[PDB]
Design a protein around this ligand. Structure first.
Ligand SMILES: Nc1ncnc2c1ncn2[C@@H]1O[C@H](COP(=O)(O)O[C@H]2[C@@H](O)[C@H](n3cnc4c(N)ncnc43)O[C@@H]2CSCC[C@H](N)C(=O)O)[C@@H](O)[C@H]1O
Ligand SMILES: [Mn+2]
Length: 252
């Protein structure tokens, strides 16, 4: 009896796979082609006014920052921060729709939730891993210039302190750097106004970050050894450099 409405956040391979399942199942959904840094619920302010607090409908927000107050019939579909232990939004959406995921889609969910380690743990071949990563990067909107700066940062802006790789870059997208350096146990990528940490012990990284910025500028996911980063242009360069030093001190 309850009718469903899905509002989609930033685009990646999992979000692209969500579009296909929502399309195949005749579901009402809205997709404004958002990126990771503009997935605001206010992007769908018109839809919230139309369907918000209307009785038959349930509104599912898929990885959307709640910059406006959601209505009473709104359900958050997310797997970050305080829900970093939840399955990927792709898995949650398929469960809502009673949709069984095929082999390809299970790989998309595993890579979305837990990268290459996630795909390896459901027995992905080297070819499947390469296919998923290529389509994930393409869905994130990485282009040739992102790959260019990735190779540059690994050759000229990288040092290894213990088990921790530290990469300075002026690149926009960081997934090319992760894929070139995998495998790794710890990876720290920073720009003059942004940093993201990948690998073991994100909670100790979270304790560092909370000494420099409010929690609204911090996001994390992917599990115990997933990722945690800062929102771009929210921290000054000296704040980023201090965090970089504190993260290197954990290697001592
Ligand atoms: N342990 C890991 N190591 C490496 N990659 C991983 C790991 N775990 C997951 N991944 C991969 O990373 C991707 C995770 O996707 P998501 O779950 O959608 O998570 C995304 C975003 O949804 C999330 N996020 C939340 N708020 C913001 C914001 N304000 N700005 C930017 N990003 C924000 O943070 C993640 C992006 S982090 C990298 C951002 C960087 N500027 C870039 O463009 O490359 C996915 O493709 C996985 O395959
Ligand atoms: Mn996502």
């Amino acid at each position: 009896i309850k009718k469903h409405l899905f509002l989609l956040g930033g685009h990646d391979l999992a979000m692209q796979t969500i579009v296909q399942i929502l399309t195949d199942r005749n579901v009402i959904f809205k997709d404004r082609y958002l990126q990771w840094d503009n997935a605001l619920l206010s992007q769908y302010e018109e839809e919230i006014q139309q369907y918000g607090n209307k009785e038959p409908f349930i509104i599912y927000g898929v990885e959307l920052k709640e910059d406006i107050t959601p209505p009473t019939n709104y359900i958050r579909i997310d797997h970050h921060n305080e829900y970093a232990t939840y399955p990927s939004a792709l898995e949650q959406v398929a469960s809502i729709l009673d949709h069984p995921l095929n082999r390809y889609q299970t790989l998309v969910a595993a890579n979305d939730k837990a990268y290459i380690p996630g795909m390896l743990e459901i027995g992905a071949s080297h070819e499947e891993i390469n296919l998923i990563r290529q389509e994930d990067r393409k869905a994130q909107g990485v282009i040739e210039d992102d790959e260019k700066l990735a190779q540059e940062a690994i050759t000229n802006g990288t040092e290894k302190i213990g088990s921790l790789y530290v990469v300075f870059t002026t690149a926009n997208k960081f997934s090319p750097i992760c894929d070139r350096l995998y495998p790794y146990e710890k990876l720290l990528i920073y720009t003059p106004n942004e940093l993201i940490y990948y690998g073991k012990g994100i909670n100790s990284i979270q304790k560092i970050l909370k000494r420099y910025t409010p929690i609204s500028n911090i996001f994390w996911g992917g599990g115990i050894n997933g990722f945690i980063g800062t929102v771009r242009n929210r921290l000054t360069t000296n704040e980023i450099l201090n965090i970089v030093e504190q993260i290197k001190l954990l290697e001592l």
